[PDB]
Every structure is written in structure tokens, then in C-alpha cells.
Scaffold this active site. Structure first.
Site, PDB file in Angstrom:
ATOM      1  N   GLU A 223       0.931  -0.873  -0.168  1.00 19.64           N
ATOM      2  CA  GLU A 223       0.015  -0.097  -0.113  1.00 19.64           C
ATOM      3  C   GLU A 223       1.028   1.145   0.002  1.00 19.64           C
ATOM      4  OE1 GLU A 223      -3.114   1.089   3.128  1.00 19.64           O
ATOM      5  OE2 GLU A 223      -4.324   0.308   1.765  1.00 19.64           O
TER       6      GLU A 223
ATOM      7  N   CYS B  32     -11.518   9.281   3.873  1.00 24.67           N
ATOM      8  CA  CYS B  32     -11.709   9.433   5.397  1.00 24.67           C
ATOM      9  C   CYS B  32     -10.785  10.184   6.302  1.00 24.67           C
ATOM     10  CB  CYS B  32     -11.448   7.907   5.708  1.00 24.67           C
ATOM     11  SG  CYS B  32     -12.931   6.681   5.180  1.00 24.67           S
TER      12      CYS B  32
ATOM     13  N   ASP C  28      -3.359   2.857   8.368  1.00 27.95           N
ATOM     14  CA  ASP C  28      -3.346   4.172   8.463  1.00 27.95           C
ATOM     15  C   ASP C  28      -2.406   4.910   9.357  1.00 27.95           C
ATOM     16  OD1 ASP C  28      -5.172   4.605   6.698  1.00 27.95           O
ATOM     17  OD2 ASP C  28      -6.714   4.742   8.114  1.00 27.95           O
TER      18      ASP C  28
END
Lengths: 241, 241
Positions: free
Chosen positions: B60, B148, B179
Site C-alpha cells: 500500500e 476518510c 493508516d
């Protein structure tokens, strides 16, 4: 579950402690501030230190309703704080009415209303004040106005609507008092509008949670903190002090 | 003064209390969640419940570095979560690399670096992820991706750089873990870059303060909370449970 946050009384205590220990920071002019970083508290009183000026807040409200980005359109005599932050043509960024009501900022109030009217449980019921281009816009034509409110999110739980207010910077004395009156106004209005859409909803205003990157007091207001620290009074005249 | 926030251990407790008491909420599909509204805590651990998948987080990260708004450019096989949220052409909004490094989003990383390099005390060192037009962009071409993360602010105090993360929604199990790895990476990089600018700075990574509108656990992960509630273990296999 709504988080178990500090109250305004506890914020007062921590700011007193900060002053008691000379925890000072040098602001962008060159002046001292005491400060709480990453402050998060329930706004359960309409002020922290100082007194309520209902007359001023009403003028600032009328200005927000006009959605005008020019500080001359503030009713009556424009406050000095607003004119020293304005551009060469008298323009600013931080008209909060423009932020939530103008179609130029993508209709923040209306879209959040539509969202919560369609799905009361939504986590994307949010009003986005600031914008990515604020990195370049804050000093357009020589203004100095980098939007202090980032986002305000609304969450309906148990028929109460709670507001989570996210700011990067908020002055304890003038800033919080004016901004609280505004957020309370918008919260009450959102409740009314949702209730008027459907009489079985019966929503109520819930909690306002205040999240501030830097919550600060300027040195010119230290006497207020100091006096409260000694007496428990949240206000004195600078003369009586 | 950095605020006296909850730790991840305290968040675990409150989430357990919520489950103990059937404090449930019906998510947008129709599934139960437990939830803390207006959550604010120091991210002093890299996960809340569950296990660390360093392999996934690295894939990611590589995707964020490419700044690609297409989920197929995620190294290897695209996670199912990413492809069910994508548009009809495989596009999304929430590449956080694009958000802070693309010139399309106004150079958030670079501008915040320049700001803090010029004034270490700044209250306007901030990276703005979301945008006003997100009210309309979240479902462009049939994607379902309402950003978000709203903003992340950086405050340099006592030669430690603190991050204040503002999100509207964060899932406790997958969300927070991925995150946090991202935000820790960006914090470490900003420290490096500022330090490389001037060897007398000697800045260090400080605290990451996590502010979430709705911090939630989905029903499919309740067993992790339940198990921790009984045993104090932050992870089990769904088989061993």
C-alpha cells in the site's frame, strides 16, 4: 459511545498549570503564548475565559449569512482584527457562512443535510470548510487568512446530533467564544431543518466536541488565566486586575 | 503542553465496555458496529486489535508513492476491499500519496515542509487531504470513496514534531493499523527532510494524536474485542476462537 472527553473546567486547569510553569511559545509576530497541542474537549460552556459579547457575535452572524468575503460587509464598524488580516481590496477567506452556504464551496450545509436525511447513521455527514488550495490562497493579494476551521462532522446517535469540530488553531479568549456561538447556531439549525423534514424524527442538539491543533492564550490575556488561577473567577476588567 | 489523551490501552477498554453493553449501531450496509464518537487518543501502539501485516502495508505504501488513483496499480493482486470501492474504470479518491505529493492537490507535503522550515513554531503546518468537492466526488463514476482522512497537522515543540490526525471514520482493526503505518512513515520522512535542511535542527518524531469522528469495530471483528475482554490477548485466529 460518545468519548469521555475533558470539559471546559479541565481545560481551564491545564491552561493555569501551563502558565504556572512558564510553558511559553513564541508566536509568529514574536509574542508569548501558552498552549495545549491536540486539545480535545466537550464544549459544555460557551466560553473559557473572558465575558460574552452577544452584540458582536450577532454582527459576525449577519456577516456569515451574507456570505461576503469582504470585511467591510460586517455590520457597522469593522473590527480591527478583521481589517489587519484582510487583503489590499478588503477581502478574506474565513467567512464561515460562505464556507457552508455558498455554491462556490460545493454546498456544504445542503449536502450534509441531504446525507443525514437519507441515512441518519452516516459517517460521511460532514461540512468541509478548508481546501487543499489554502496552501496558496491564505495570502492572496496580501491577506493573512489561513482558514482556522478544517471540518465539522455531524453524527446522529440516539436522536441527538453531535458535532465534532476540527480546527488547526483557536485562541482561547476571543476565538473559542465566537466560534462556539457559530457552531451552536449551525447545530441548532441542522436539527430544525431535519425535524421540519419529518415530524417523527424528533432530533435534539447533542454534544459539541472541540478538537484543536493548537489551543492557545496570548500574553495579553495572561492576566485572565492568572486571576482565575487565584480566585476561580473567569473574568476581570484589566483595570480591576 | 501536549494534551493528556487516552492511550490505545484505554481505547481497548472502552470498546470492550461498549460490547459488554450491546451499544450497537446499524452501518450503511445494515451490519452492526460498536463505536466511539469523537475519539481522541495518542497512537502509542501500532495496532488496537488484530495482527501486523507488514507485507500488505508495504504494498500500500508503494501504491501511495506512485500517486495512482487506480486500484490496479497496487502491487500484485488488488485487495477485494479496494476493488469493491472502485469506480467502473477502477478509479478511487483515497490514494494518500496523491493527496500529499501530487501537484493536483496543491503540493501538501512540500508546502507544509516549506512552512515549517521557515517558521518552526507555525500553527499552519498542515496537510489537507480532503476537499470541499468531496461532497460530489465520492461517487464519481460509481466509486464509493468519501475520503476518510480530513487533515494532518504538524507542530514542532521542544524539537519534537507532533502529528494531529483528523479523520471522520476509521475502522479499528484494518483501518487504524494501515493508516498508522502511513502516518508514522510521513512523520519520519518530514523529520528527516527538515533535519537534512539544517544540521542544527536535530528534530525528533514526537506523538501522533488520533482524532476520529466515528472510531468503529464491525460485527465480523467482535470476536477479537470479546477475546481481548476475557483474556487480554489482542489477537486470535477465528479458528482458535
Amino acid at each position: 459511545m460518545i468519548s469521555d472527553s475533558m470539559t471546559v473546567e479541565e481545560i481551564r486547569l491545564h491552561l493555569g498549570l501551563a502558565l504556572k510553569e512558564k510553558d511559553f511559545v513564541v508566536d509568529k509576530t514574536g509574542v508569548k503564548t501558552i498552549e495545549i497541542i491536540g486539545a480535545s474537549f466537550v464544549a459544555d460552556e460557551p466560553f473559557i475565559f473572558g465575558a460574552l459579547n452577544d452584540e458582536y457575535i450577532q454582527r459576525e452572524l449577519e456577516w456569515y449569512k451574507s456570505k461576503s468575503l469582504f470585511v467591510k460587509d460586517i455590520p457597522g464598524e469593522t473590527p480591527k482584527i478583521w481589517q489587519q488580516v484582510a487583503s489590499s481590496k478588503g477581502e478574506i477567506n474565513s467567512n464561515y457562512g460562505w464556507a457552508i452556504w455558498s455554491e462556490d464551496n460545493y454546498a456544504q450545509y445542503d449536502m450534509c443535510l441531504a446525507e443525514l436525511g437519507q441515512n441518519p447513521d452516516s459517517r460521511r455527514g460532514i461540512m468541509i470548510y478548508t481546501r487543499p488550495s489554502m496552501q496558496f490562497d491564505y495570502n492572496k493579494d496580501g491577506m493573512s487568512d489561513f482558514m482556522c476551521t478544517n471540518t465539522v462532522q455531524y453524527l446522529i446517535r440516539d436522536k441527538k446530533i453531535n458535532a465534532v469540530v476540527n480546527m488547526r488553531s483557536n485562541d482561547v479568549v476571543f476565538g473559542f467564544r465566537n466560534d462556539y456561538a457559530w457552531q451552536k447556531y449551525v447545530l441548532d439549525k441542522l436539527v430544525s431543518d431535519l425535524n421540519a423534514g419529518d415530524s417523527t424524527r424528533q432530533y435534539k442538539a447533542g454534544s459539541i466536541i472541540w478538537n484543536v491543533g493548537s489551543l492557545h492564550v496570548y500574553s495579553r490575556h495572561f492576566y485572565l488565566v492568572d486571576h482565575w488561577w487565584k480566585t476561580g473567577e473567569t473574568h476581570i476588567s484589566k483595570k480591576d486586575y
